[PDB]
Amino acid sequence: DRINTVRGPITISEAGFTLTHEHICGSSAGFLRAWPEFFGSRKALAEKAVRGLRRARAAGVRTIVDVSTFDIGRDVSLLAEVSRAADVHIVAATGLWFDPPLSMRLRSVEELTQFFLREIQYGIEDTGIRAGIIKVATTGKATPFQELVLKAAARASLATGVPVTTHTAASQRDGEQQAAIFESEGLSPSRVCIGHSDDTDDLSYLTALAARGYLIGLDHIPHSAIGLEDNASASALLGIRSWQTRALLIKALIDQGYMKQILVSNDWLFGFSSYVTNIMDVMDRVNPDGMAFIPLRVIPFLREKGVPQETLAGITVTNPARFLSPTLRA
Amino acid sequence: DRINTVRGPITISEAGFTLTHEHICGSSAGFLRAWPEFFGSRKALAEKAVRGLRRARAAGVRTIVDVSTFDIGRDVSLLAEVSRAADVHIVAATGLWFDPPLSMRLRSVEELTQFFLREIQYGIEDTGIRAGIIKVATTGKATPFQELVLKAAARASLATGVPVTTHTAASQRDGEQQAAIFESEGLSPSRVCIGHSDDTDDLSYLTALAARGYLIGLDHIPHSAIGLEDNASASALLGIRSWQTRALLIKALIDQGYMKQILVSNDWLFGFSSYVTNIMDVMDRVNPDGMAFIPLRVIPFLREKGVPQETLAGITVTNPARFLSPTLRA
Numbered sequence: 001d002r003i004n005t006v007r008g009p010i011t012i013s014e015a016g017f018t019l020t021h022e023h024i025c026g027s028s029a030g031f032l033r034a035w036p037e038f039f040g041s042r043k044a045l046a047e048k049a050v051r052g053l054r055r056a057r058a059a060g061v062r063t064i065v066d067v068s069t070f071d072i073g074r075d076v077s078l079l080a081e082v083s084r085a086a087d088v089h090i091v092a093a094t095g096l097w098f099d100p101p102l103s104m105r106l107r108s109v110e111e112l113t114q115f116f117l118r119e120i121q122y123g124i125e126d127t128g129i130r131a132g133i134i135k136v137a138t139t140g141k142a143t144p145f146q147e148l149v150l151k152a153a154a155r156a157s158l159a160t161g162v163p164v165t166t167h168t169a170a171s172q173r174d175g176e177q178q179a180a181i182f183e184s185e186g187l188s189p190s191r192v193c194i195g196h197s198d199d200t201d202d203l204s205y206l207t208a209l210a211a212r213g214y215l216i217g218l219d220h221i222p223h224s225a226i227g228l229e230d231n232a233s234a235s236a237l238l239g240i241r242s243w244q245t246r247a248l249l250i251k252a253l254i255d256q257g258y259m260k261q262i263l264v265s266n267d268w269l270f271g272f273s274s275y276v277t278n279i280m281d282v283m284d285r286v287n288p289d290g291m292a293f294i295p296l297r298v299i300p301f302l303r304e305k306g307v308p309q310e311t312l313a314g315i316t317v318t319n320p321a322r323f324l325s326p327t328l329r330a
Numbered sequence: 331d332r333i334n335t336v337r338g339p340i341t342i343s344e345a346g347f348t349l350t351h352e353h354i355c356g357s358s359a360g361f362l363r364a365w366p367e368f369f370g371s372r373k374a375l376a377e378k379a380v381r382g383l384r385r386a387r388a389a390g391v392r393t394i395v396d397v398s399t400f401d402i403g404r405d406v407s408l409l410a411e412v413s414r415a416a417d418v419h420i421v422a423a424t425g426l427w428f429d430p431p432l433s434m435r436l437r438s439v440e441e442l443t444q445f446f447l448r449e450i451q452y453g454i455e456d457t458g459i460r461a462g463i464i465k466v467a468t469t470g471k472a473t474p475f476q477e478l479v480l481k482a483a484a485r486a487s488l489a490t491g492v493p494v495t496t497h498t499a500a501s502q503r504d505g506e507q508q509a510a511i512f513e514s515e516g517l518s519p520s521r522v523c524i525g526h527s528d529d530t531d532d533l534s535y536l537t538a539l540a541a542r543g544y545l546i547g548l549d550h551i552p553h554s555a556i557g558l559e560d561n562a563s564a565s566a567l568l569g570i571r572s573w574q575t576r577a578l579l580i581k582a583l584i585d586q587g588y589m590k591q592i593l594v595s596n597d598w599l600f601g602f603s604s605y606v607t608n609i610m611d612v613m614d615r616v617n618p619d620g621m622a623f624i625p626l627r628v629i630p631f632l633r634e635k636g637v638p639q640e641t642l643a644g645i646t647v648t649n650p651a652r653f654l655s656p657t658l659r660a
């Protein structure tokens with residue numbers, strides 16, 4: 001009946017319009033505190049995030065789920081600061097992405113389970129802020145270590161009711177193996193969002209996962225290098241499919257009958273240090289609306305394509321609350 | 331020039347008997363703060379380190395150089411805390427070891443130079459604690475990223491007079507390529523310690539570097555898996571060359587006239603999370619003396635082998651002060 005945020009528990013009603021895959025800052029463990037000048041300053045970064053979150057809020061957003069893990073350099077104290085300043089709820093994450101350091105990579109499934117449970121049940125670092133989601137990642141067939149991460153994630157989720165959300169390379173159809181591993185632990189698909197799923201045009205891959213009860217994370221909508229195709233790093237990260245093509249997968253799934261399984265987001269950030277130095281600026285050039293891109297551009301676009309506003313509210317308000325509210329079987 | 335410690339700059343007169351390659355805790359960036367329980371608790375880790383440092387102090391040690399980098403999960407606040415409690419000087423390090431996260435590995439040589447310079451000239455994180463040494467690493471032929479790090483280290487050293495110290499795969503003679511890259515940047519060898527050099531039996535290789543002006547880091551002396559050879563993880567880490575064999579390399583270098591080029595250490599730690607879970611316990615079982623192993627075991631061993639106390643004081647006191655005191659040519 002409550003969802004953990006960086007400012008404490010909130011009710012389902014309070015969550016309102018929720019972006020389910022976002023980042024305050026995409027970085028690495030310890031990096032923001034060691035090298036804040038990378039971002040101009042910590043103060044500059046915070047101010048940029050507050051401005052963006054306020055614009056998102058003005059456009060209707062009430063909550064974001066920051067899926068930054070330990071190895072994305074999640075700094076929950078920065079999350080609490082910007083959540084307060086912008087008056088937008090922020091759900092923090094545990095789990096591991098695809099940059100774990102040796103102190104993580106050398107750990108067993110039982111140890112990883114203890115760590116994910118600590119961040120959910122006890123708190124992150126010494127902040128007392130508890131995670132409300134578990135983030136995991138594969139990029140192709142899981143490595144032995146990623147299998148342990150996925151199993152530990154399933155176990156943390158089975159012990160707490162907190163859902164799991166994933167990074168995929170969708171072109172690799174990663175969600176199928178992720179699903180196999182999750183189900184081998186007995187995790188309910190209702191507690192799992194297969195992320196970056198808008199990276200594929202293969203609808204049957206998505207419908208087949210949806211038919212099994214998985215949530216489908218269409219969270220990369222504004223990610224496009226259209227207009228800057230000769231920028232190799234940007235093209236590699238963002239792809240060359242338009243935002244409109246990605247958004248139309250939302251309508252496709254609705255039409256098939258899976259509106260209840262759909263989660264949408266921007267996968268935006270306000271700082272970004274794990275890639276080429278100025279990738280944040282290039283991204284801002286692509287999508288000046290930032291996290292307001294979903295409410296400001298995607299929802300009117302889908303309404304124009306005939307999707308009722310009520311279906312869109314179901315997707316952006318009802319689905320996220322059902323997903324996040326702790327349970328073993330939603 | 332004054333030597334930066336975690337309690338502020340000290341004079342050469344103050345350094346005393348110095349261990350030039352040690353760790354309070356070998357971990358990963360952000361790890362200690364995210365998962366202190368891995369070490370029992372932060373409090374427990376600190377207590378263990380204070381006990382250890384006090385044992386070292388009682389055996390004659392006055393200063394250690396903690397060569398833990400950002401990616402070894404260096405926590406200078408912990409270093410400051412135990413330095414004060416044990417009244418042993420601690421010199422902190424900048425540079426990068428073998429586990430840089432993406433936010434570091436994506437960086438240019440100029441960017442890395444700026445980061446190393448920040449940690450030397452400005453301070454580490456927001457603590458104001460300034461590094462007194464730069465740590466780098468190769469394991470065999472340098473990776474392209476490692477080439478950048480060594481060049482950036484050379485440049486930071488050339489701007490500050492703070493010396494560079496290295497990890498090597500000694501049996502592969504990594505020191506020769508490191509030397510080549512350092513000299514291609516114009517770095518004086520008198521500002522460079524080639525570490526883990528007691529890992530090799532090749533005295534030709536060691537004396538050729540020493541004659542060129544390099545410091546030779548015989549810093550692994552108590553590292554040995556003798557008595558636990560069937561422990562694959564410990565054997566891989568510690569090797570099976572005896573401590574006596576390593577120590578006799580000190581005498582060998584002395585006997586060939588290179589006493590001024592020698593720096594000796596334990597490469598000990600009070601915490602260890604980047605390997606198998608209980609490796610610290612296994613290590614403590616190998617060497618209950620911890621950082622006191624050099625003064626209590628090695629010095630008397632060498633005395634018995636005929637090395638005069640005065641040569642040993644030159645190695646353990648005179649050499650480290652000359653190495654550490656900032657200069658572009660020692």
Ligand SMILES: CCOP(=O)(O)OCC
Nearest residue numbers: 353355356357402497597
């Ligand atoms: C953090 C440990 O670093 P190392 O000295 O390379 O290995 C120590 C056993």
Ligand SMILES: [Co+2]
Nearest residue numbers: 166167168196
């Ligand atoms: Co991702």
Ligand SMILES: [Co+2]
Nearest residue numbers: 022023067267
């Ligand atoms: Co993301």
Ligand SMILES: [Co+2]
Nearest residue numbers: 496497498526
């Ligand atoms: Co080393």
Ligand SMILES: [Co+2]
Nearest residue numbers: 352353397597
């Ligand atoms: Co070391």
